[PDB]
Structure 1
Amino acid sequence: TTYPVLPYLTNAAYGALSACSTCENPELNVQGQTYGLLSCINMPESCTPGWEFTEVTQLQNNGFVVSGPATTSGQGNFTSPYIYNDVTNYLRDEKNRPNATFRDASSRRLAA
């Protein structure tokens, strides 16, 4: 709720990075601090992580994408965000029992 950056800017940055500017190889995962770094966005360090670790795990288990600062610095110092997991909000199946066939964005790209 207290994200110090305008929302749609971060979403555009994530999409552009994965929009074939890095995904000419269908099997490349956009994660980590090397590949999933939204360099163009700069924000000051927050006084609290925002997403408590108890909540980060739940979001990842429910098919959401969570991002956080790329480097640890004192409060108020500028940093950049990066993406933890690349997931496609996919759970269950038409045939109702669950699986993780399309749990990763790379799976959709590879299937195509």
Structure 2
Amino acid sequence: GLLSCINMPESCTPGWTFGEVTQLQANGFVVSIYNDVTNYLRDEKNRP
């Protein structure tokens, strides 16, 4: 899954901090790669 053609400049401050990472992951989005889920979080009536 590692994106080959990116070559992003390295740093220390990543981005979404751990808390934000959990928020994104649980809620949905595929924050990078890791957790290649599709944002669903719910259903017709019952969430899980």
RMSD (CA atoms): 1.4
- Larger strand proportion, structure 1 or 2? 1
1:43, 1:97 → 2: CA distance? 37
Deviations 1:37-84 (A, max 9, x none): 111110111241111111101110101111xxxxxxxxxxxxxxxx11
Over 3 Å counting, the alpha-carbon distance change for 1:37 and 1:96 in structure 2 is same
Over 3 Å counting, the alpha-carbon distance change for 1:43 and 1:51 in structure 2 is same
Structure 2, gaps ≥5 residues long: none
- Larger helix proportion, structure 1 or 2? 1
Shift of 1:97: 4.0
Structure 1, gaps ≥5 residues long: 1-35, 67-82, 99-112
1:60, 1:97 → 2: CA distance? 16
- 8 Å CA contact 2:26, 2:41 repeated in 1: no
- State, as a whole percentage, how many aligned pairs show the same letter: 94
- Greater Rg over alpha carbons, structure: 1
- 8 Å CA contact 2:28, 2:39 repeated in 1: yes
Over 3 Å counting, the alpha-carbon distance change for 1:49 and 1:97 in structure 2 is closer
Which TM-score applies when normalising by structure 1?
0.38
Instruction: Show structure 1 runs of 4+ deviating over 3 A.
Output: none
2:20 partner SS = helix
